[PDB]
Amino acid sequence: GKFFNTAVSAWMSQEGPNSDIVLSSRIRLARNIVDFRFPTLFSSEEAKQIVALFERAFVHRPYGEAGRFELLKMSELQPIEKRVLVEKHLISPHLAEDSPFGACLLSENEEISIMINEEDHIRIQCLFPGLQLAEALEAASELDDWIEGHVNYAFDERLGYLTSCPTNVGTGLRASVMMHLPALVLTQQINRIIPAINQLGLVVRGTYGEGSEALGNIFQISNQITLGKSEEDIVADLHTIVEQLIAQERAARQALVKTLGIQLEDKVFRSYGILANCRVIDSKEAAQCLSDVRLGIDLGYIKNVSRNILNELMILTQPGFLQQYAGGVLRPEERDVRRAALIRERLRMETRL
Amino acid sequence: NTAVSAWMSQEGPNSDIVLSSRIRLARNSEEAKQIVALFERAFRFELLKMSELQPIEKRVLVEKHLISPHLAEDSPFGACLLSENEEISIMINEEDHIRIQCLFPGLQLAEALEAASELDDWIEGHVNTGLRASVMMHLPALVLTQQINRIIPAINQLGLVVRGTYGEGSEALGNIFQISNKSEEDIVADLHTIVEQLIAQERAARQALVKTLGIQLEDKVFRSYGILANCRVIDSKEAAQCLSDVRLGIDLGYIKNVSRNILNELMILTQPGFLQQYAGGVLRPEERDVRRAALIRERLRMET
Numbered sequence A: 001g002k003f004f005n006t007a008v009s010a011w012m013s014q015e016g017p018n019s020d021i022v023l024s025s026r027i028r029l030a031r032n033i034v035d036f037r038f039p040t041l042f043s044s045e046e047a048k049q050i051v052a053l054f055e056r057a058f059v060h061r062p063y064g065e066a067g068r069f070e071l072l073k074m075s076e077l078q079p080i081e082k083r084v085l086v087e088k089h090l091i092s093p094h095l096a097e098d099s100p101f102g103a104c105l106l107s108e109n110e111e112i113s114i115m116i117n118e119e120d121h122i123r124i125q126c127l128f129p130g131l132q133l134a135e136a137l138e139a140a141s142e143l144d145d146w147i148e149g150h151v152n153y154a155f156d157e158r159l160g161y162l163t164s165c166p167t168n169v170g171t172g173l174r175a176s177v178m179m180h181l182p183a184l185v186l187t188q189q190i191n192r193i194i195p196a197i198n199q200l201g202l203v204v205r206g207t208y209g210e211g212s213e214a215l216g217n218i219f220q221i222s223n224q225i226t227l228g229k230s231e232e233d234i235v236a237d238l239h240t241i242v243e244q245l246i247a248q249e250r251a252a253r254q255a256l257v258k259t260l261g262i263q264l265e266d267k268v269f270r271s272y273g274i275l276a277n278c279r280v281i282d283s284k285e286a287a288q289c290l291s292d293v294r295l296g297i298d299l300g301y302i303k304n305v306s307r308n309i310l311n312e313l314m315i316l317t318q319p320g321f322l323q324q325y326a327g328g329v330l331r332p333e334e335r336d337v338r339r340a341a342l343i344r345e346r347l348r349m350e351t352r353l
Numbered sequence B: 001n002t003a004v005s006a007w008m009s010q011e012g013p014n015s016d017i018v019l020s021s022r023i024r025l026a027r028n029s030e031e032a033k034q035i036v037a038l039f040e041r042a043f044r045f046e047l048l049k050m051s052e053l054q055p056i057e058k059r060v061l062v063e064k065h066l067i068s069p070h071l072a073e074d075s076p077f078g079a080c081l082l083s084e085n086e087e088i089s090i091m092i093n094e095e096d097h098i099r100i101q102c103l104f105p106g107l108q109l110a111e112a113l114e115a116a117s118e119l120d121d122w123i124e125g126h127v128n129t130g131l132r133a134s135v136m137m138h139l140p141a142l143v144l145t146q147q148i149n150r151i152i153p154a155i156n157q158l159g160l161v162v163r164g165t166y167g168e169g170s171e172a173l174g175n176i177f178q179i180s181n182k183s184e185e186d187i188v189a190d191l192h193t194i195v196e197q198l199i200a201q202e203r204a205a206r207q208a209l210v211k212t213l214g215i216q217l218e219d220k221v222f223r224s225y226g227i228l229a230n231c232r233v234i235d236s237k238e239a240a241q242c243l244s245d246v247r248l249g250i251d252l253g254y255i256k257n258v259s260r261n262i263l264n265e266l267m268i269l270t271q272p273g274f275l276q277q278y279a280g281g282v283l284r285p286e287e288r289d290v291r292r293a294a295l296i297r298e299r300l301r302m303e304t
């Protein structure tokens, strides 16, 4: 097990291209199994038979470099354990909350998460640190071939892979990128980009996906069109949009430095001073300050602090990890004290060494 | 070369609340020069002539409380005699011919008056009633617990004045207030009793805040510490509030590795005269906010 102890696995702690702004790359493949009804129509037995179908096939069959697969059943996990998986981005909020027969199939390296009995019978999702959409598609395609050797996909040649929700009919592909855009939010150029992004077929979402708000200036950029295009082209289209979004973030940072100057240096250090010394902090402010301190490390204002630890605090300060860190359920008053105590401790360590 | 002399940095009785005590005794053109020339022959003390000081040097002595603003600006022919420990400061040609001033740290009015009259006999003994007794108090709990606007009419009724040291008009910046005032010995004893009454009320108000706010009070004091120790721009008012918070946090024991002198010491060094002196050249207001923050970071960095 021990998927619950670390916030960012060794796989995901690797430095990737454009890791200063692009946190990770995700590629989702949606599939349904023949002779079972869809997740939107199907009885409790078809749910547990699908989980039984996957459990039989993949428990005693490792994945090489990825490692052996462990089957996690939502019914057998505790509410913190579910929230810790959502907060580590392993499973969706839909699976942890609204899917009692849901399951998850995790590789040891935690780069592969296969969601069972969610919106689709199968949600194959690969995760790569930094911007690596092309690499994530080969691994997803390679895994997709590997899985359909042991199960039979419900596919119509004209229709394509059958899906419960109209939004992902056809190839069943959602490719997304998670990006930190503090400068585009501060310059308010994010109110222009978002609607422009929607016009090209891309969708802008929160840190935990649809229904999520943007925590700490971290947004999810994913394609919405799922028809009339190959997987390779839609991944190529998302990449170029992300390349433009990277350039706009990096240029807006120079505009902020040239315009604000010492005031921007004052903004990031004040946020540092709060996080390093506060005794009570809420989820909203902690995200804003951690975003500011991350901005300060990228620009060179803040020294002796790694940006990885800040990537790790965004997760460790979420309700799931905090309770686990505390060891037991926490009340809303208690979480603001624990959250601030956690952040001081991790920063105290950085200064010493 | 120092904002608060080694004499002033010493602990005094009730120095957690009372920053210092002072006593100003009033005693009595060409004759004015004769008076200055008569003192310099008499006097170890050092003499400073206003006509030989430049405007920045004038503003630094007023920020230190060593010389009055009236003498620095409306008396180019004035003079001042300073002690080595800066305890004693004698002003010449202010409102009266001599205005003798004593400064002890904390609440030591009796000791300050004793010395004040003692060298007055020394002056009367070699050459041939306007008493102004004051204390400075840091009262953040009586301000935050909303008692301060009730107490100052009660204090005025007994014949004592209350004036914010650093705040323009009624507003007091940094929660630092000046309390000032029959026989001389009754006047100082009359003030002394009310001051202890204010100390008892301040300390009780601090316990009320701790018992009431708890972790929230600790968060407020440390957030103010985090700002001062790390900010790059800060104005006169935010610095005054945060220094007041940090001092309170040190008094209550939350902040354990910073000496309480920072309040006494930075509220004087953050004044325009010392700020310009800090930078070494005239500063425009936006440059002051940059220099104000840099000075406070160095001071906190010196303890921590």
Ligand SMILES: Nc1ncnc2c1ncn2[C@@H]1O[C@H](COP(=O)(O)OP(N)(=O)O)[C@@H](O)[C@H]1O
Binding pocket: A024, A025, A026, A028, A089, A091, A092, A093, A119, A127, A174, A176, A177, A178, A205, A207, A208, A209, A210, A220, A222
């Ligand atoms: N780039 C990315 N990195 C990490 N996680 C990502 C991601 N893009 C999407 N996700 C995760 O994918 C999960 C589902 O996101 P959602 O927007 O519903 O896409 P979906 N259901 O079509 O697969 C979310 O819980 C979100 O945390």
